[PDB]
Design a protein around this ligand. Sequence first.
Ligand SMILES: O=C(CN1Cc2ccc(Cl)cc2[C@H](C(=O)Nc2cncc3ccccc23)C1)Nc1cccc(N2CCOCC2)c1
Ligand SMILES: O=C(CN1Cc2ccc(Cl)cc2[C@H](C(=O)Nc2cncc3ccccc23)C1)Nc1cccc(N2CCOCC2)c1
Ligand SMILES: [Cl-]
Ligand code: NA
Lengths: 305, 305
Amino acid sequence: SGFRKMAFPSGKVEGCMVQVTCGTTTLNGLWLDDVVYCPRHVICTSEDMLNPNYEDLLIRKSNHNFLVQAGNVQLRVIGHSMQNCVLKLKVDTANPKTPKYKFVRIQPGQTFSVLACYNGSPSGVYQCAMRPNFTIKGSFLNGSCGSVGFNIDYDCVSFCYMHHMELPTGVHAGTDLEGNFYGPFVDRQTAQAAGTDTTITVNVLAWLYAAVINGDRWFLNRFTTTLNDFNLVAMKYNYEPLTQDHVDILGPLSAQTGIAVLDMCASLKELLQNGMNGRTILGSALLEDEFTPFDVVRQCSGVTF
Amino acid sequence: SGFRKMAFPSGKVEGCMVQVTCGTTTLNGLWLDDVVYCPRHVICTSEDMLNPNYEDLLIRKSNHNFLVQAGNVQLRVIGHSMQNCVLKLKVDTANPKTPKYKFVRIQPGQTFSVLACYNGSPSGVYQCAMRPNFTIKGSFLNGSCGSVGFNIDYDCVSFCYMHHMELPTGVHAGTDLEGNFYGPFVDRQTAQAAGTDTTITVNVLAWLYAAVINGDRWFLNRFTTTLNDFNLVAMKYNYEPLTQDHVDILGPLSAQTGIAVLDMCASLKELLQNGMNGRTILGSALLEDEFTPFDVVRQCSGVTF
Ligand SMILES: O=C(CN1Cc2ccc(Cl)cc2[C@H](C(=O)Nc2cncc3ccccc23)C1)Nc1cccc(N2CCOCC2)c1
Ligand SMILES: O=C(CN1Cc2ccc(Cl)cc2[C@H](C(=O)Nc2cncc3ccccc23)C1)Nc1cccc(N2CCOCC2)c1
Ligand SMILES: [Cl-]
Ligand code: NA
């Protein structure tokens, strides 16, 4: 019993964290096999950041201008290339701690663990979600650039995010491990803003199924809804539209608890209307949207209470 | 910016997790130097759980009855002894991954990271607090026994908790690494219940300082209070009494934000009497009490390990 915002164990990623330095800038890198991946903005000065020409800045660099430190060991850079907004530094030593891994690009609503790092040294681990507006609500200070997001389903590490910047509202933007930004963001100090964010409807539904599995049914009702009537109500509370894909994804949890997806949708509609009336669901007074259907099945018991 | 429930990086503890099997029971063990530590109830059958005489059950056992697996490697048990509710299995191989460590007993209100494990394999990491009633609101399924709690101080792992049981309300009970229970619990199948819990006042105050640091100030007011008047109000809402030690501990955060501790206490008093009025603090509609003053300072300064 219980339900916590749970992160994957971070050890396999801690053994990959390194510090990358170019002139006066220092940030984090990810060392996998003989390559160190880091944000390309490590080659920038604070002045360069308004309209940097990364191709022009990089062409002026040699291998020996990049200092890479792994623990108290200096690694030797023997090659460098840019792939989208990521710099790939070839090094003369393969990481003996390289886990089994993949690079995966995730979609909004997906969750992952973040290993926040400073100067190549891990400081903390937390769980988060790719918001519908492609930002992440992280906890990052200056020097955290290059910290990564990942999942570890079945001993293989799937890297999905590399941290690049903090937007004016305090939220964060980054790229996949191939350097493609999530969202309409660019790695420069031009005026950019997070779009209006919405609630991840399929995740709130998954979390309501987690509450039922853990024994809580107070929020259920005798009603059902059509998918279109549900979406008309949900859009009025800034909730993402629920698609037939989301309904199919919730199938296993519907079968486990005996509550049809559109029946749980009717419960969500009522909760949006009435609020919680001094009650909580899984220790929360708000409707939680950073647990996916897959996270609920991974964490919860296979036997409903 | 940002504030998340953050755990310590778990790698140094992952390298210590092993599987302990005796009879039909399989649980987790902690391998440090040449000893594997695990709950002494691993020697019990379901029948033995009502009134176990653990010395009498342990006498029947020989070293070869305990099967210890470290990954896909069998460890050889060469001795066994009991210390309070913890079984210590001497093995013929020192853990080459043993970190610098200490066994520490924590007090209620203190937080720690839990590395939840099944079959000696780490599955997740989360942050939690030792409740004033000596339970932890964890997330544990059957097979999680032997999972440990810890903090990291510089490079030293301080182990503070080993998981033993789940109470009828879904909360959890365990021991320090010397086998002493936190709370009035016993390792046997008998009628046991968590006592009435209270809110950790000093931690709510620390979290209100974290909210101010992150830009949220709607709850601040021009008023102050005495420690005496604050405790009279706090006891009315089942909040733990605030002592001069807690006030001294909040000194750094008071100086950083310019809000005296008794000024923040006046804010907390108004929140208890009026509620939040549709507003949230750090994304929460409840007053969060699982961040200590040290956790707030650490997260708002990027300390690494
Ligand atoms: O001033 C900068 C400089 N950055 C420009 C810039 C532009 C484009 C790209 Cl791709 C990267 C970056 C870097 C950047 O965002 N770095 C950071 C990453 N994650 C968290 C951070 C938390 C604080 C600071 C930096 C962070 C560097 N940024 C900044 C963004 C948002 C708020 C603030 N603060 C309000 C004023 O007090 C001080 C913190 C300062
Ligand atoms: O079945 C057992 C047996 N335990 C006896 C026992 C006695 C003393 C000691 Cl020191 C340890 C233990 C074990 C124990 O607590 N293990 C567990 C630890 N963490 C999470 C768990 C999650 C599920 C199950 C076990 C868990 C094993 N307990 C149990 C725990 C919680 C609810 C219930 N309920 C039954 C009645 O229906 C409604 C659920 C039954
Ligand atoms: Cl995805
Ligand atoms: Na005040």
